[PDB]
Symmetry: C3
Subunit: 340 residues, 3 copies
């Protein structure tokens, strides 16, 4: 909610409180999404200042407060900053910003990152360019310098982040995206490549010196309809764990596909149909193994701009012999959301 607008500066203070619960069978462990209470809240700010008529500064910070821990020792489980960056926007030359922010390949992956609760399985965080990263410098240009309406692009510089863990680390790398939008249609191409850290190189699964990720996207978004499709591939970048062995590393290659179709009724209801499949190839020891495979059915009902409710149902297609240990049971989530 915009709580401040004085002398050039507008501040927006936003957040949500989401009561959420997942119903899986068994112990949750062989199930898609797990099982039990999954409540959380969110809180962030979004500021913007008019430095002059062609020049804007802006900043953003967003945090996640888990709502399913006790008030003892486990208190902080899963609490974290999702976003923290500052930048400048100048007339038709472009914007530039630095900080923790969305990587360039998510410029494509967000097309299908629209289910009520699940989806966007290939857009992991702290995973090079596919979702939120730390340390990126991003340059974005709109409408080709003011010359071609709807033609945009971006380039992004990722700096090395040598963490304690191979999963949350990364060497230096560059990415970019090009996209075009016209009368409800949109098409996108994104691509990035990076160096893998020494600790990444020592993991038992995956071999190579460079991480790579790309995706393509197509969408029709108009007249209350939303249909979208994504297709992408990666070499050495997606995190995988062998649950039998307890080994870990990255998949040599993945070929990913995600399709979504939604409809917005005028009275508040938004049904969703979706399909997802992600498969790893040349996995040291295993061969071709599906990481993700399902059908999704769900609906959201918007009481207004601040209140909503939802059911999200995953008909998991993974099967019970999957060689990595990927679970095969379905999962249902029911949620009630207040936001401002």
């Amino acid at each position: 909610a915009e709580i401040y607008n004085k002398d050039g500066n507008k501040v927006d203070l936003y957040g949500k409180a989401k009561g959420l619960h997942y119903f899986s069978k068994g112990n949750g462990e062989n199930s898609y999404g797990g099982n039990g209470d999954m409540t959380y809240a969110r809180l962030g700010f979004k500021g913007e200042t008019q430095i002059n008529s062609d020049l804007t500064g802006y900043g953003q910070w967003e945090y996640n407060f888990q709502g399913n821990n006790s008030e003892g020792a486990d208190a902080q489980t899963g609490n974290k900053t999702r976003l923290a960056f500052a930048g400048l926007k100048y007339a038709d030359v472009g914007s530039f910003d630095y900080g923790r922010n969305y990587g360039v390949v998510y410029d494509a992956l967000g097309y299908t990152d629209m289910l009520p609760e699940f989806g966007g399985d290939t857009a992991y965080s702290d995973d090079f360019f596919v979702k939120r990263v730390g340390g990126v410098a991003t340059y974005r240009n709109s409408n080709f310098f003011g010359l071609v309406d709807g033609l945009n692009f971006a380039v992004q510089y990722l700096g090395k982040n040598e963490r304690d863990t191979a999963r949350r680390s990364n060497g230096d790398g560059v990415g970019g995206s090009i996209s075009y939008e016209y009368e409800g249609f949109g098409i996108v191409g994104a691509y990035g490549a990076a160096d893998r850290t020494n600790l990444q190189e020592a993991q038992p699964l995956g071999n190579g010196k460079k991480a790579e990720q790309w995706a393509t996207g197509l969408k029709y978004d108009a007249n209350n309809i939303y249909l979208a499709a994504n297709y992408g591939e990666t070499r050495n970048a997606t995190p995988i764990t062998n649950k039998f062995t307890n080994t870990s590393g990255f998949a040599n290659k993945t070929q990913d596909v995600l399709l979504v179709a939604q409809y917005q009724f005028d009275f508040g209801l938004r049904p969703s149909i979706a399909y997802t499949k992600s498969k790893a190839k040349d996995v040291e020891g295993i061969g071709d193994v599906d990481l993700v495979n399902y059908f999704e059915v769900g609906a959201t009902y918007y009481f207004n701009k601040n209140m909503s409710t939802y059911v999200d149902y995953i008909i998991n297609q993974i099967d019970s012999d999957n060689k990595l240990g990927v679970g095969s049971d379905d999962t249902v989530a029911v949620g009630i959301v207040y936001q401002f």
Copy 2:
């Protein structure tokens, strides 16, 4: 403070900064409340949206920031979310909400949960239904569907929370409360029962498969006077530690009593007299042992709605041979509070 009120939505952003210090003797350890700096701050939001004339949505999140840790390694000690939930309120049918929230037996226990700094000793958190829990679904009805003024009730569903620790865990359980209020008098009954987790069952102190808690409350709140009394019992639910042995578990039964009397002067002063006693029965190895036993004397001085100060003095009646290791020295707390 209500910082936002536009188009149906009202947002309230609230918090406090409390400088607090406790004076006990010795090393604090044989003392009621401990000794030294105990400063903290609080911050939360409370949102409400008018979906139509009979229909409201609402949400809440509240956090606790300890103010007595260093800026090193110990930084987060005792930081946590106290509340996180969302819900709907519909005309005279009732409200329903889900999330981390106050359990149903606190509907009774809050009567006496009114001292400046201490008190409400039997209302522990993450302890089934007596204070804040995670994962509860709560249904509350006011004025019996609009038919009887001042007659209210609630039912609450608690879902299993299998944590790392027996103290912060719980199986599934149900509770309810009934209460009546008329011309400054109020009476209440609450009751809940639950399953105990496997890890609870393995603790050395306490035996059984079900946790139970109930309390009764009576109050007179009018003409600046506040008098209130609570009486409750529990089987297998209250956490106890044997300090000699270092063993732990739950008390087989407790019989709890709490009485309070306050007065609100018109110039700002609010004196408080209180009495508290909590005793465990059939404690494996020990027998009947008092957990809590004291007299309280204290005063709060309200400078206004935002500023106040207080002294809270505990004349501890526990004695120096107590068989569980319960401390027996008094404790004094002095505090200065800013809130908005």
Copy 3:
């Protein structure tokens, strides 16, 4: 930003989002400031209530959210409360407040604590009276009871904080400051002494029962110019580590000097020149060793009150044989700041 002003109460909600990166050579380790992403955000509140015409209450809380951790396990690294206190201000008698706050010797040290990114090296936190501490009671008087314009003083009571670590601990102690300001000139004297905890006493470096710190300050702040100088000494209080041995404790004595000169152009640019040196004497095993020694060159460019950018360059004078292990390579920091 002042988001609330109703019925006596004014609330200010403030914060920043700072994209920051340091460029050192090597592995960062033999370098002044280290190397890589160092982004963070900040968020705090500042409240004030008019209790009557001579009487004000106030409170403050401020937090630090690191922006350079992943969304896994390392999530909280370096997150903490910097400030949390409440107090009262009464006409010309003085203010009094309690909580986590700036210690009295920083009344002097802040003179030179003005570089874009670096500086103020002798003002460590949780280090007795030189920067932010926990548990202090502070009394401050302005203009000598209304009698002498510009003559101020303060007394501060520090209570024992027995933490897990010698570095973040402290016994009881008292401090004070006296200062005078006239037509752009200001002079200051601060002094405090404390008891050292048992764990402090057991560290291999440093010997004694009392910690002491003092500093003097001189400044000219007018007509867009800022020149300032600080001189201070400490006995047994500054934390030092021998990097060879891996031993730790406090320096027997330090003689500290800090000088700064800045200029504020009217178009937005603020160049900065600075010099710093801190040296420990009678270090058990070593003798006289420099802890800090450098030259600083930098500039900040203010786009407005909310947006700015900076470069801060440290020409490190420490040398490559330094006996404690102090690094000797330079460091450059580049930052972009949004604040409200």
